[PDB]
């Protein structure tokens, strides 16, 4: 129902959100988990990973496995690995130690948790998309600005003359003769022309749009230049292995195709 | 959630970090170790190698194998090879001699360590990436600067005239006639035009981006010009051989694919 | 962690070292020796050859085979071949005669040594790399200088006008009309434009980079124009033959692939 005027006013800030909500979603569903307990929502895991970079996996006695969010600690190991994970959720404030490698059978109080990383550098994925979206929107705006410039390549300066008379000849102009300004109506001694031309480049500002889209796909992992999703895949597999070690759960991870 | 204005302000310093954290991670996981003891974290080894260039491998009595960092010595061999390795970690300050070749059975007190090199020149890998990242970011900024220049190819100088009247004709301009400035409203005797054109080259500043990315891949070893990862592979294999010689451990190294 | 500003200041002197330490290493490991005694380090041999051009091979009674460095003599043979080899190492100053061809069984006191050449002209390999590195770095700097020139193709001279007003119209410029400078605010009688254009050639300053890299590979032996590593291979084989003649050791040499 929205009228065209309601959109022409806000143009850059709509393309941006449109592409932002699209790329975020297209990322949230890049990985497919299996063998998980029916209590944890995978969508929550993926969202938290992509937004923040990490998420904890610590079983609770009453509630259950309770895939949970929170912060990391400053008390670390010799190998630059944290020790305990405090939650940041408003209702829950539980804390728990973490588990990285096995230490015989007498490892700990069996109350530890496991953490998952979006990538070895704890870098969220939104920092790339929030940029490529901006680029694509700026491009879609530049394209309009450059296409709307092919209506006004020239201007005519008619100082003393009037507009209605000058404009009606162009209205009753058929084509059997050129345009002619004659009569005492007109002055024809001050008229001039000016070249306001603007080159056409929107044919090339599209290929750039596509290049940017393909670069976003690449640096996202989903397919000049190659892309390796191992950055996001390997830590997940490693944490899955740690989980299957601590417990008896057989978890796996991979793309959707 | 970030608004476009929050990003347009900081542009070069975000692309830089984005590509930096990406290349660093993509390198940290180039090599896959096997047969190692469950006490040493390979990620720590690779990080320390790429950041500094070397890392020691000396077994401790109490803790274990304790893959450890530190400095090198000035007391060297006739073959320009150090003798002992002092640690730089804050909590640990242990020192230990090194082992390069075998000397019968009566070699030493069996308390020596082994060192691993990122490459024969002790050159860290970050020096290449910290440069290619800068190049790529500067390119992504230049591309924006050159695409945003196709909106302002010309300017109109209307000294005595006013802006609202001049700008409303362009608003109620349909297309059945050219643009016409006429009436006592306007002066039409001082208007002029200026060509502020800017060539379009962003179609070529992309191929350069891709060339730089491929060069970074090449000089990294992961695939005009060829790339040899033997620079980073051979010293690792050699140190692995030394380890399997000193001890009975069967270690190996290779890429992930 | 290094910030972009920490690198933009020092640019030429970082690329240089980066490529220098890379080419040196890539050369140190071009040849693979076999059948050697476990006392001599091949890496030392190759380093000394490439750096200086030659290295001696003289067995010692106490220490062992003791692959050693040093200088050459002025007392030469009729065939322009030296006689004795004095060492330059700080701790060792031993001297020993050399062995070039056999003279029956009663050749000498069996205390002679053998020398190895990097090439018939005693030319070290660093003289080529220290040049190609400089060329490549200068190129990587020129490319930046030429890409950063596409932001400032034109300049506008607004003498009497102010900057904020002139710059805000470009900020609230949408695209439905050209740019217009009108009002008593502006003068519009002194504004001018100047063309500061700079051609784009970085698309060709890359192919030159690649040509230089391939030339370095060629003149290094590791693969328009061909390259013969026999320059570095033949004297090594010849010295190996001399060694297998003087002693009973079966040594060999070749590339790594």
Author numbering:
A (entry chain F), B (entry chain G), C (entry chain H): 8 to 230, 251 to 284
Would you copy out the relevant sentences from the publication that reported this structure?
The Portal Protein (PP) complex is a central component of Caudovirales virions in the process of self-assembly of phages. The PP has multiple functions: (1) as a nucleation point for capsid formation; (2) as part of the motor for loading the genome into the capsid; (3) as a head-full sensor; and (4) as a conduit for genome translocation. Using cryoEM, we determined the structures of two portal proteins: GA1 gp10, and phiCPV4 gp17, which are phages of the Salasmaviridae and Guelinviridae families respectively. Both GA1 gp10 and phiCPV4 gp17 PPs have the canonical fold and domain organisation found in the portal protein phi29 gp10.
The GA1 phage of the Salasmaviridae family targets the pathogen Bacillus pumilus, causative of serious infant infections. The GA1 PP (gp10) has 52.4% sequence identity with the phi29 PP (gp10). For GA1 gp10 the tag had to be proteolytically cleaved to prevent the formation of rosettes and the buffer pH adjusted, to obtain sufficient oligomeric particles for cryo-EM (Materials and Methods Section 2.2). The GA1 gp10 dodecamer has a height of 78 Å and the outer diameter of 152 Å. Assessment of structural similarity of the wing domains between GA1 gp10 and phi29 gp10 RSMD in aligned atomic models demonstrated that wings in GA1 and phi29 PP have nearly identical folds, which is not surprising considering that they have a very high percentage (52.4%) of sequence identity. The N-terminus forms two helical elements on the outer part of the PP complex where the short α0-helix comprises residues Tyr8 to Arg18 and is positioned in a horizontal orientation with respect to the central axis of the PP. Arg18 forms a salt bridge with Glu148 of the adjacent subunit. In GA1 gp10, four hydrogen bonds are located between the α3 helices of the neighbouring subunits Tyr139A, Thr149A, Gln154B, Lys147B. However, there are interesting differences in the arrangement of the clip domain between the phages: GA1 gp10 has a beta sheet formed by β8 and β10 strands from one subunit and the third β9 located on the outer edge of the beta sheet is from the adjacent subunit.
